[PDB]
Symmetry: D2
Subunit: 419 residues, 4 copies
């Protein structure tokens, strides 16, 4: 089925078709002069997918307040319905990331709804950073690394349950992010807490299917404000290496210390085969969870530059999971996810334009200026025509947000859902 009327999509596409043809043909000619086939780029772009977070479909908030908009989803099924719009218009978000227990519901019904909407499911996300109804042990002082054996056991069991749910809907990975840490010096013994965490994760790994991957995710701080067990990529590497071949590291762009060179972390994990996936978003201060590329678009391009270089270097078996992990506090969640998915494809497309042979030459000759200008020649290229054409050719909209607004979807769900 189609959440957005096909006639609206056709209408809004035809309205912008002439201009797109002009821009696409112009870009094609420019690229041809640069020895690049625009068709080959568009072909790869229409194959690039990034998962949308079920929890980012509703309006997000801070510890100070939540300001919901109209037609907020009542649950996971409404969320899937809204995710269907993002995929229909961008054609870059075929899979949805579920969060348990936030999205707990009959797995069979979830799969049924997903299939009907043309949506698949990406990595499952466990939640032991908050307490659920009737929970025997609280995670106030931790979960997988809690000092209490029974609490760690309960946390392990929760993760295994997430795996069961995922196996029923077609998910092939479990992402584990916990808030475990301390707010005061001395509250936790750094090493003992990490030892407890490794032991618990070993139990989860033992219950991990052999066609699944286990992603551990580091974060410098929040909710813990003094120390965090899985605080950075170094600790994360130790975890993945210790657990096994199926265990890898997930890199969330907003989880690093100020000024960190994140693209280098990406390169390092790839070199040692532990880059499991990404959580895309942008930020300026902390884990701001803003729309991808809205603050620092070049950094996003530089991360993708390392991914494309890995392919160019001949790295094998490298298929990192791509997921958006954002909070939309002051915009229509659907529009933000739409443009964020767009921005990720934008950075990817520009990375594909880098003249790898030229760059390699400038790197070997230590021609720093031309090496950086080689990256800029790709990054400065406005690939919007490629992104728009890719969408058009695949059933999407030339201008996703414009078509979304022309459809009146928000007003529609606002009337179908409570205030």
């Amino acid at each position: 089925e189609f959440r957005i009327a096909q006639d609206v999509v056709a209408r809004e596409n035809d309205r912008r078709a002439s201009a797109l043809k002009e821009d696409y043909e112009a870009l094609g000619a420019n690229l041809a002069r640069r020895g690049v086939d625009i068709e080959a780029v568009t072909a790869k772009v229409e194959k690039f997918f990034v998962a949308v977070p079920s929890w980012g479909v509703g309006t997000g908030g801070t510890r100070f307040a939540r300001f919901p908009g109209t037609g907020e989803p009542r649950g996971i099924f409404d969320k899937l319905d809204d995710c269907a719009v993002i995929q229909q218009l961008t054609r870059a978000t075929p899979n949805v990331s579920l969060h348990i227990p936030w999205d707990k519901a009959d797995p069979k019904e979830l799969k049924a709804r997903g299939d009907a909407l043309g949506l698949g499911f990406d990595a499952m996300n466990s939640n032991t950073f908050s307490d659920a109804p009737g929970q025997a042990h609280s995670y106030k002082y931790g979960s997988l690394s809690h000092t209490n054996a029974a609490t760690r056991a309960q946390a392990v069991e929760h993760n295994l349950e997430c795996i069961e749910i995922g196996k029923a809907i077609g998910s092939k990975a479990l992402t584990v992010w916990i808030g475990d840490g301390s707010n005061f010096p001395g509250q936790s013994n750094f090493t003992r807490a990490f030892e407890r965490y490794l032991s618990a994760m070993a139990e989860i790994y033992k219950g991990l299917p052999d066609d699944w991957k286990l992603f551990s995710e580091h974060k410098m701080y929040e909710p813990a404000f003094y120390s965090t067990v899985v605080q950075d990529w170094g600790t994360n590497y130790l975890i993945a290496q210790t657990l096994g071949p199926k265990a890898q590291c997930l890199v969330d762009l907003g989880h690093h210390a100020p000024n960190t060179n994140i693209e280098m972390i990406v390169a390092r994990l790839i070199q040692f085969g532990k880059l499991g996936g990404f959580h895309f978003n942008d930020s300026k201060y902390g884990d701001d969870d803003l729309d991808a590329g809205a603050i620092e678009p070049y950094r996003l391009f530089l991360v993708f530059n390392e991914l494309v270089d890995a392919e160019a270097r001949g790295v094998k078996g490298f298929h990192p999971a791509h997921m958006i992990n954002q909070s939309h506090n002051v915009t229509d969640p659907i529009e933000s996810l739409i443009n964020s998915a767009n921005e990720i494809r934008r950075a990817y497309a520009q990375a594909l334009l880098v003249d790898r042979a030229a760059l390699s030459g400038y790197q070997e000759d230590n021609d720093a200026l031309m090496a950086t200008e080689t990256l800029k020649r790709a990054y400065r290229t406005d690939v919007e025509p490629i992104l728009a054409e890719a969408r058009r050719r695949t059933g999407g909209a030339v201008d996703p947000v414009a078509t979304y607004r022309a459809s009146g979807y928000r007003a529609r769900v606002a009337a179908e859902r409570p205030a």
Copy 2:
């Protein structure tokens, strides 16, 4: 009234009296050899007070979750009862800061309960960073600087109501902290938003009694994640200078960019007569709101060093409002506030030990090493005996938290108040 039984306080004090006498006498002898009269220090420490936040006695949380403890206060009345315990045991927190509309209630009752508990009221706190039930205009996109005139008017009226409540309870100041800002480049026109904020604040200023002060509080980020209207002390100064004599700047320790020299900001505000007050807490990453001094005790000392320097140079018209502004997510709120107030008095006491004459001499001759060592000689001094003796002589506890736990207060209120439930924090 005595939230904590006097027999328990006396008992727990006598149990530690012998050791305290020994430590106090030893420190007194050491200070004497250093030309300092311990009695003079203790006398000033007993008179140093810092306000406790009414909302601080309840367990706090993050956007990810909240894990309330037992006996959580139901409202302002329960909160005042808990604050009374902090004051009784530390004798450093006689005043409480209210937040509206969280603590809205009959002013007469608030004053009556405060007087009965031996508590006064510090600066009022307005709230236009969240929406209340039945509110006509949302603050989602701002309040005092919102693009919608009616929304700014509503925010102004709210602040004026806070002043009215404050006058009725004995308060003499209004602290204004808003989340106003943007999460995306272009969303807000920096200049126009600030102009709107200034115009609205001018209206609030007009409602200030002759003996009141208006404190604007800067914050680098959160809830706004790209830009914030009142983002730093520079913008804050422009605000205070523009509004008038009654307008000053409030400095919250955890509201600055990484590595910022906060003690210099304090000095600058004092120099230009705009240091309105402080919001004490500690942090390591962002506006962590941790227990004061639990992370960087020396920084707290350095801030107080600037305060004592001004307090010693007879800086006239210098009465900065001191307040604790913390969130207690993994401890008993009352215990943390107790030790936080203690740490603040600790930093103050150590600042009092600094040999100002010696320091000035080393500054003039550019003797950096001895200048810094002069501060360290004061900071390295364990003033706990002075803090404990000050509490003992004023009706407090030698060891506040030990006495608190010995009284069984938490278990008591846990049995009198309804149970709470853990839940999310606001992310979804």
Copy 3:
């Protein structure tokens, strides 16, 4: 001509066809967006940024300096090199001098400038290092030093900078000092600032009627605990205290991690104290890297504030624009060329912003479309506009390629002896 005209023409012709195709395509796209590319190119052709005399030589860190070939031996060699940057980019007609590094007969400096087609921007004083024969050391400070005689010496140095500037055509003095402390207690924050204010008041008295005095803040380095002029708040206090001729200079790399710099720019403009800019890029500290090489969007956002000021009708707004960088691992001339290009790039994109649309989205709190409105401008590849601007004004379509084709570096390497001691 530092670079042979036949080389510039040859390299321009080689790229003319492609430039025509790209410029005409961009023109059509902009026309569809309601923008006149000719109007934008006409404005870009007139955007100038000053080149630092000290940036034409290779820079270094406290750990090492690795000079290249043909390093300029003095200010005259430096001006000759700056002439190359102006000839090829046509965006750097003025040079910033630093005293005493560039001390020389003002008449000779002026004569060399005129001969090369170069002017002089704001003068820069230096009381963050000791020169020979100095009666007092600046080890513990200069304008804010505890010793009155030392402050007096620093004041006289700044006045000498003004005298030199008056003779060569300069109209402003930029004052950046390292004054601060490395240890808590070493300095009395307030007294040090008062000392600074008194000294600057004396320097202000020496300013001609049409001159400006720019004070520059910096969070740290060389002082690692406190710095007298540490941020824009202190800087504003200085400017407001000194008078109408005193304004603040904003150096992009002098702010705390994560600082919203573009907002500082907006605040200073609102209160009429934005004197000028020191452009460069950075990732960690005051890295002094080529402008826009690290965070091109931030550079655009700063220019967005500058263009908005013009749109709001701010009167008498003529901020000074200067590049302040250190080239440690590249040919200084090439980096300055591309840095000047990046600055014009950000400026050009700022001009493309549909502010009519932006104002509507801001009023309606449509954050998504507001940010997308800025992005539609920023995502636009304005290189064809920059290249055409150069073609029309005697510059090179591809400045660095032309510079390399000219063999200029090898030429000066053969003419200039490398320092041995």
Copy 4:
């Protein structure tokens, strides 16, 4: 003896009475706390930290260097000054050399060391700067340079450092390089690291059976975009890859803002790769300030992790301790004296932590009492312990006071020619 024995004795007797009072008072307080002050003093007396030979000379920034009087020039003058620090603090018996700065006949160095009562700690190689006559420049890197001959030259230099070390009593080589990039694209992150690992493997082969190889990470400077060995994660990969003799060196000021450094220390210890420390303090970047002058609690928290290990004697836990600072505005000897003091101070306080009580509060999740347990130790003024340890071992009760009373600085100023009177 660099410092006259009569001066040391005189300045000790002058402060003996007060010390007796303070030491006894602290001893009584600790006894009421179940702690034997003597056990602490005995351990403090044996805690040593190496002094950098280059640390006794005045340091500077990229903007300027302001030398003091009697600047030591050459390793011999430097060792003479280092001897003063050891004589007065008794906490710095070993000196760390830096090659080629300290190049000299090994037999002569060893002889001078023995004569002054000084030993030698880890050797430090230098491939972050170019020495005269050098065949290949390190401008674009050293061990990870793209040019094979340059990497070979860097490897040979490090092997030479090992040979010098073997001749003087050293048992480790610390490798810190500036290798990195200033621009995105300049370096291929992975290939540069591959080259580094291969080059380090060659240096590893030259290590005697009882030697250690310490690689040191640094976020930035001299590289301002990326650094090959940028953090502890990369450092761990290096040490684990090279072998048992390879470990990581943690320099306090080489981390990103807000980093929890004590956790990094704990992680390295758990995996047996904590080779040693480079002590100093900072507020902004790699400020290289006097240890504990800015954040004394952080220093204590680092030592809390060390003592937690020293108490149990963890496998592979025998960290080398070294001071790595730059003294730009103080007498280098005085700063090193007080820095070594602060290091012993933090160690002594960490020794006071009631581990049993702490472990209990950690298991019960009593965060408030757990942190208060650390504070009870940290708030304790251990100066009497540090002073008594010095007095009992031939040092000075008040090191800096004795240093000034001796007139040493004026003495060496009279023996050493400055650049200018």
